[PDB]
Design a binder for this molecule. Structure first.
Ligand code: HEC
Ligand code: HEC
Ligand code: CA
Ligand code: CA
Ligand code: CA
Length: 278
């Protein structure tokens, strides 16, 4: 499809997977990462603050080394899209950069092409294949994911293709986006990265009653929280007019002792299942 902002648009909303986390104003609905409307102008300001040569260089850096600068208000969730699973080609990354420049700026093809030697080549990825130390299958991991008899049941909070209960984010298609290393960290260090919007809020009512949990739904008159305890959940509906204070906390209700509740085999099988969610 070549290096053009028009090709980059197809990739951003296509196999670049960018629109699974980013929206552009009212285009798209994803909120995992920053809204990219006006990104071209924003990048110029980040480049000045960070000592880079241009906003375009900041955009390049944001793709090749997502962890190097973390936008305030977000965690380190953006994958290196040139690595598996996405394995976005160098030509596709250049096209995406042209599209990003068009978000409030003008694409500069000559300038973009000069960064080609800085974009890692997906075919030459340094990532070693993911091979669990036991034989496990994705089908085995699906059984674990939904097993209600275990001390932890992912399906109590996560939905996949219409199955499971919606508390945390739906995981449909996540294996097309994230690495097994991210899945390991999500399960064993759940509060290390918190999907945007799934923070725990600490609420205090006028009567002095505390409620700590995830906001399920927030309307004009009622706030519904999901409380978590020992992998079990419960909903409470709090009248808004009874809320005295509320404070967001950078902690997750994705359970913190999964490493103690799953066997080695269950753990690696669940990871295989997630990888298979394409
Ligand atoms: C969710 C798993 C993401 C995917 C898929 C993509 N991006 Fe992302 N991006 C994400 C987050 C949480 C953040 C903020 C934290 C950080 O790493 O800085 C970002 C940031 C960017 C930026 C910088 C934006 C800014 O305001 O400075 C850019 C330019 C960007 N991301 C680009 C981008 C592209 C082109 C993607 C598809 C190839 C893409 N991202 C996917 C989360 C996620
Ligand atoms: C309710 C008590 C949950 C249970 C049971 C499980 N998860 Fe969870 N998960 C939950 C929340 C509220 C969030 C968002 C905040 C955060 O910690 O990031 C998550 C997140 C994840 C993710 C990241 C999803 C993403 O889109 O990036 C993963 C991969 C994940 N959780 C995996 C997972 C597994 C394997 C579980 C069973 C062992 C599991 N979760 C249970 C809430 C809850
Ligand atoms: Ca970044
Ligand atoms: Ca997490
Ligand atoms: Ca209770």
């Amino acid at each position: 499809t070549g290096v053009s902002a028009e090709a980059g648009e197809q990739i951003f909303w296509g196999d670049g997977q960018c629109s699974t986390c980013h929206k552009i104003g009212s285009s798209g609905s994803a909120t995992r990462g920053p809204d990219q409307e006006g990104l071209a102008e924003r990048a110029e300001e980040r480049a000045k603050e960070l000592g880079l040569s241009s906003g375009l260089e900041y955009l390049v850096e944001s793709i090749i080394d997502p962890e190097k600068y973390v936008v305030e208000g977000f965690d380190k969730i953006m994958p290196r899209v040139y690595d598996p699973p996405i394995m976005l080609s160098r030509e596709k990354i250049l096209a995406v950069l042209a599209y990003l420049q068009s978000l409030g700026g003008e694409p500069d093809l000559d300038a973009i092409m000069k960064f080609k030697d800085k974009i890692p080549e997906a075919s030459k990825t340094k990532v070693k294949p993911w091979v669990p130390p036991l034989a496990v299958t994705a089908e085995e991991g699906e059984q674990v994911f939904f097993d209600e008899s275990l001390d932890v049941t992912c399906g109590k909070c996560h939905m996949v293709n219409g199955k499971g209960q919606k508390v945390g984010p739906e995981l449909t298609g996540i294996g097309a986006i994230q690495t097994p290393q991210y899945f390991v960290e999500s399960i064993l260090e759940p509060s290390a990265v918190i999907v945007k919007g799934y923070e725990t809020v600490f609420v205090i009512t006028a009567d002095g009653i505390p409620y700590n949990g995830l906001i399920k739904s927030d309307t004009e008159e009622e706030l519904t929280l999901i409380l978590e305890e020992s992998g079990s959940v419960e909903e409470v509906v709090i009248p808004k007019d009874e809320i005295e204070d509320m404070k967001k906390q950078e902690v997750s209700i994705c359970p913190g002792n999964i490493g103690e509740l799953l066997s080695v085999r269950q753990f690696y099988a669940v990871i295989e299942y997630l990888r298979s969610l394409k």
